[PDB]
RNA sequence: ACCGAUAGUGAACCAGUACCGUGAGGGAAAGGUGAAAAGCACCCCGGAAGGGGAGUGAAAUAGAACCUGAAACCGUGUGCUUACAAGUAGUCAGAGCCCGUUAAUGGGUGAUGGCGUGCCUUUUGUAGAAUGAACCGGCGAGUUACGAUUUGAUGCAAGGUUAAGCAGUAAAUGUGGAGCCGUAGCGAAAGCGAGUCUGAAUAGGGCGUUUAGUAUUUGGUCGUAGACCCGAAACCAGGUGAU
RNA sequence: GAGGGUAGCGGAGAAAUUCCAAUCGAACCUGGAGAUAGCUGGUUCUCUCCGAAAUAGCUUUAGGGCUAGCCUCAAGUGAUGA
RNA sequence: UAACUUGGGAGUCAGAACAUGGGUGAUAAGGUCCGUGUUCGAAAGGGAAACAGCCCAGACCACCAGCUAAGGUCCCAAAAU
RNA sequence: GACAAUGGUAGGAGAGCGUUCUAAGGGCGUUGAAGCAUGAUCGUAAGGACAUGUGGAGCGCUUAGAAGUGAGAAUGCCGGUG
C-alpha cells in the first residue's frame, strides 16, 4: 500500500510556529527562521533559571549592607556576629525586616554587637 | 516569592552637598558615585532610579598626589585622519575646574541608558556659591 | 524503476560550465515522473509447516470448541427439496446464534444448496475442514456419521 | 477467537530501519562510519581478502588426492542391536525396516561398541575384530 | 491486505498531439457547479467588461477562471508601544495601560536592569572572511529473491523431515520416502574402527571417544543480483548529416 | 548564382590541430547502460542504560584495506583483578 | 571491585595544546620526531577583560534556601577604604 | 522503605509515538463524517482529546497482520509568490 503524506507534517509545523508568537518579522511566521529560534529559547531558559538564584542572592545582600552601615558598622562583620549567636535567619528574610520594620532590625544588630 | 520592589509612586529623591577642599580627586569621586546610584539606600533597586541629587562645591583647590600636576594627560580624538588632542592635569584644573571632577566621577558610572541618566543629577561649580537654594541641600560629611 | 520509465537516454546539460546541479538523466529519483527505487515487486507470501504441527492445530479448535458448549450432535439431513426456510426453522428449534458451522460425511447437494444464503451460515465437508473457520463459528452442528468420519480420519 | 489473537511470548521482534532521524541512533551515517570505501554503496572487500598482502589459502600448499572408487559403509553398532528380541534372525532387509540403517551405501558393518547382552543371528556384508567375539561370547554365529 | 490526478502507461482531456531539430530523434501541461440547466425574466451606473437589487435553487463567497480552500505574499481598520539611541533580535526580572478564559497562584503590550557572536557539513580546531539554502507547498535514499551462520519461539526425539507430481476454490491438506541432516571417527589413499595416523615400536605425539539432534519461523550479519541514493572525463555497436 | 560528389577506424586542408549545421587532439542520435568512481554531496519520529580511537605488523601501500589493541549485548568459570 | 574464556555487531588507522627527559634546528618557531602525565577531541559551569587544550570543578528535573574551591573585597561589580 | 547510579561524538542494546491498508468484534454520522481555522486543555517525549466557525458524506475504537511508514539542507526536481 502506497503511504502518502498529509495532516501530519502540517499539524507539526504548526506547533512550531505557535510556540513562536510575538516574534520580531519573519520569526514569528517562516518555520525554518522560528525553529531555530525556540531551540535558542529553550537553551536560554536553561540556562536562565539556575542564574535567576544567583542575581537574588546578590540583591539581598545589597540591601542588608545599606542598612547596617547606618549602625557603625559593616555587612561582613554583622553576618560574623550573627553566626556567633546562632540568628541562623537567611538574607531573604533580614532584607524583608530591615525594610517593614526598621526598628526590629536594630534588636538584631545589638545581639550580634553583645557577641562580638 | 515576597521581594520588595520599588518603582516610580514611592521613591523619595534628596539634595546633598559636598565640599572638595584638600581632598584627593579620585577618593572623593569614589564615594560620590556610589550616592548617585542610590547603593546607600536600603530599597536599592537594580532597574529603577533611587539616588540622590548631588552639589560639588569648590571644583579648583583639589589636591593631587605625586607629579600628577604634569604626568597626567588626557587624550581625545576628532575622528579626522591625525587629528589627536591632548591637556595636563594641572593646566585642565585651573582652565576648567568643573569639567576635570565630571570626568572621573561619570567614569565610575554604568554606561548604559540608566546610567547615562543618574550622571545628570551632578552638579559642580568651581566657586564656592551655588544657585540652588530653592531646594534643601545638607551638608554631606565624608566616610 | 529507473531503466522501465520511457526515455530519459540522453544528458539534460553539460557536466560543468553553468552554474546548475548535476543530472545525468530526466527519470532519477529526484525527479518529477522518474523511476521508483525499492517499491513493491510481484512475489508470494505463503510458507509451510509440519505435518504434525497441522494436525495439533486442529485438535486444539475442536477441543476450544467443545469446552465452551458449542458442539451439538444431529441425525442425517433428509432434505427433499433446496428450501431456506425450513432450513431457518430447524435452526431456530435447534435454538442456534447467527454464526454456525455445520459438516456432513460427504458433500450434500440439498443441504448445502439451501442454507448458502444465510448471512453467517456456511457448510463444511467432515475432511475438508479449515482451521479458519472453526475458529470463526460460533457453534458447531454435526452428523453422528460425520463425527465418527472425523474422529477416526483425523487424529 | 479471531479477535483476541496473541502470539507466543518472545517469538517476535520488530525490525530496525536506518536513516529516520537521529534520535533513533542511525540517523546520518546509518551506522556506517565517515568517509570510507566501506561506507560507499555496493560494498567493501571480498570475503576472503582483496589486495593487500598475499592470502593464506595461496601460501600454503596442497594435499592428497581423491579415490574414484571408494566405497562407504553404514555402521551399526551392537548396542544398537538390543531392540530385536533374542533368538532372531537379523537381515539388511530387516534393519532398514526397523529404523535403524536410513541409507544402506555399500553394505552393512557391524561395531563392537557396546554390550549385546542377547541371543540372536545377524548376517552382513563385514564385520570387526571386535564385533566377532562379542557375538560369538554368549552364542551365536555371524555369516558373511 | 495494487494507484487514485506531482500517483497510475509518456498519454483519465481527440497525446506521440503542442513544441524544439536539416535529419535520425526528443517530448509536455490540462479531471470535479448542482439531484435536476431549473445557466439569473425584470430595474439602476457604461461605449463595454464589471457591480448592486429582484428571481431559480437546501445553499449563488455552488454564477460555468464554478466541490472543500493551507502557506509564502499583497492591502484596510483597530488595543498597547516607539524620534539621545550601538541591537544573532531571544531569555530571566519588571512598573504602567487595555481585556476576561477549556477558570487557572488568567490573556495582550512593554519604560528599564542582567546574560547572550544562526543552522547543517567537514575538521586537531569554525561567529567564522571554509561549503549549502531567497521564501512557502508537494515529491525525493538499506528493499526483494535465493543460499550461509547466529540468537529467540514452537512440534517431535536416536531420530527429524519433505521435493517435483496428483486431487482440491489460483483455495492450505490429504497423498507422494527419489532425496537431505544426525546417530563414529582417523588416514593423501588402500584400509582400520572407539580407536586411527605417524612411526621398527600407544614408546611418545596429533586428531577422536561431547558420542542430541532435526523441520519451520521473528530479529542481527554475510554472499550472488545495480543492492542506501544522486554525479563523470571515456569505450563499443547500429544509424543520420557537405542547405 | 543553380544543379551535384567526397561521411567519422572517415572526409577536405597554398598546413593553423583548420573545417565537416552557433560545438571537433576526433561530429550528432539511439542502444550495451542503472558502464565504472578506493572520490565529494545527501540519508526523514521520540525517549532510557553503556561508551571509544586517531596505535603495532603487512600491503603496487601511504586521505584504502586486513589481523591485533581499545567499545557494546548474551551465555559460562569463580578470587584468578587494582 | 573488578579480571578471564567462548559466541553476535561495530567504529577507529589526519590528532592538538600544556608540564617534563631527549634527538634534529640555531640551548629559533604556534617547527618536526620519540618516552611519560593532564585536558580538548566527545565537557556544559566559575577565574584568566574577551580567548577549544591554562587554574577550580564533571550538568536527571524543579526552589526568590545554607556552606565552600580556583580567584577576590575603593566605583563600574557581590564581598575589609 | 534504605542505599547506590543517571555529561556525552563514532558505535552496540532495549522500551515506545504517529501514518496507509487487511481480518474479527463493537460503534458514530444530514438532529451533520473527513478536511480546514481559533482557543487560556492533557501526558516524562514523539503526541491525544473537547468547544466554536466553515464543510457537505463518510469515519473512528480494541486485538492481531503487512509495508511505496515519518523530511530543513543533496549549487536536488516541479508549481506559486517576493
Known amino acids: 500500500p502506497r503511504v502518502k503524506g498529509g495532516t501530519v507534517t502540517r499539524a507539526r509545523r504548526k506547533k512550531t510556529i505557535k510556540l513562536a508568537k510575538g516574534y520580531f518579522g519573519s520569526k514569528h511566521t517562516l518555520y525554518k527562521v522560528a525553529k531555530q529560534q525556540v531551540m535558542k529559547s529553550g537553551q536560554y531558559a536553561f540556562r536562565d533559571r539556575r542564574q535567576r538564584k544567583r542575581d537574588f542572592r546578590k540583591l539581598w545582600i545589597t540591601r542588608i549592607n545599606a542598612a547596617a552601615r547606618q549602625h557603625e558598622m559593616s555587612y561582613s562583620r554583622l553576618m560574623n556576629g550573627l553566626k556567633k549567636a546562632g540568628i541562623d535567619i537567611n538574607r531573604k528574610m533580614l532584607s524583608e525586616i530591615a525594610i517593614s520594620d526598621e526598628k526590629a532590625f536594630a534588636q538584631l544588630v545589638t545581639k550580634a554587637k553583645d557577641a562580638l | 516569592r515576597q521581594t520588595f520592589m520599588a518603582n516610580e509612586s514611592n521613591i523619595e529623591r534628596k539634595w546633598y552637598v559636598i565640599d572638595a577642599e584638600g581632598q584627593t580627586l579620585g577618593r572623593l569621586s569614589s564615594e560620590v558615585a556610589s550616592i548617585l546610584r542610590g547603593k546607600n539606600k536600603v530599597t536599592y533597586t537594580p532597574h529603577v532610579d533611587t539616588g540622590d541629587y548631588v552639589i560639588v562645591i569648590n571644583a579648583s583647590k583639589i589636591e593631587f598626589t605625586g607629579n600628577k600636576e604634569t604626568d597626567k594627560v588626557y587624550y581625545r580624538h576628532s575622528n579626522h585622519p591625525g587629528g589627536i588632542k591632548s591637556i595636563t592635569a594641572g593646566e585642565l584644573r585651573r582652565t576648567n575646574p568643573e569639567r576635570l571632577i565630571e570626568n572621573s566621577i561619570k567614569g565610575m558610572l554604568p554606561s548604559t541608558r540608566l546610567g547615562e541618566k543618574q550622571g545628570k543629577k551632578l552638579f559642580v561649580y568651581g566657586g564656592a556659591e551655588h544657585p540652588h537654594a530653592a531646594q534643601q541641600p545638607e551638608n554631606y560629611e565624608l566616610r | ?155 | 477467537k479471531l479477535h483476541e489473537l496473541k502470539p507466543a511470548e518472545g517469538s517476535r521482534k520488530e525490525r530496525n530501519r536506518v536513516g529516520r532521524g537521529v534520535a533513533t541512533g542511525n540517523g546520518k551515517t546509518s551506522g556506517r562510519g565517515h568517509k570510507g570505501q566501506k561506507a560507499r554503496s555496493g560494498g567493501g572487500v571480498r570475503p576472503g581478502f582483496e589486495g593487500g598482502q598475499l592470502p593464506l589459502f595461496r601460501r600454503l600448499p596442497k594435499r592428497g588426492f581423491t579415490n574414484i572408487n571408494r566405497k562407504e559403509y553404514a555402521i551399526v553398532n551392537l548396542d544398537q542391536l538390543n531392540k530385536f528380541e533374542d533368538g532372531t534372525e537379523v537381515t539388511p532387509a530387516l534393519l532398514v525396516e526397523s529404523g535403524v540403517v536410513k541409507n544402506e551405501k555399500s553394505g552393512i558393518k557391524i561395531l563392537g561398541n557396546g554390550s549385546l547382552d542377547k541371543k540372536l543371528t545377524v548376517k552382513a556384508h563385514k564385520f570387526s575384530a571386535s564385533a566377532a567375539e562379542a557375538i560369538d561370547a554368549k552364542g551365536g554365529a555371524h555369516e558373511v
Open chain 3, 1 to 155: 524503476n529507473r531503466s522501465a520509465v520511457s526515455g530519459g537516454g540522453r544528458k539534460p546539460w553539460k557536466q560543468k560550465g553553468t552554474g546548475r546541479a548535476r543530472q545525468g538523466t530526466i527519470r532519477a529519483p529526484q525527479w518529477r515522473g522518474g523511476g521508483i527505487v525499492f517499491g513493491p515487486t510481484p512475489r508470494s507470501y505463503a510458507y509451510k509447516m509440519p505435518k504434525k504441527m497441522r494436525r495439533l492445530a486442529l485438535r486444539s479448535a475442536l477441543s476450544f470448541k467443545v469446552q465452551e458448549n458449542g458442539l451439538t450432535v444431529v441425525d442425517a439431513f433428509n432434505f427433499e427439496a433446496p428450501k431456506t426456510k425450513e432450513f431457518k426453522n430447524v435452526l431456530s428449534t435447534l435454538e442456534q446464534p447467527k454464526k454456525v458451522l455445520v459438516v456432513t460425511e460427504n458433500e450434500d447437494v440439498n443441504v448445502e444448496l439451501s442454507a448458502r444464503n444465510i448471512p453467517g451460515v456456511q457448510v463444511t465437508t467432515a475432511q475438508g475442514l479449515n482451521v479458519l473457520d472453526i475458529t470463526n463459528a460460533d457453534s458447531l452442528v454435526i452428523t453422528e456419521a460425520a463425527a465418527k468420519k472425523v474422529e477416526e480420519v483425523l487424529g
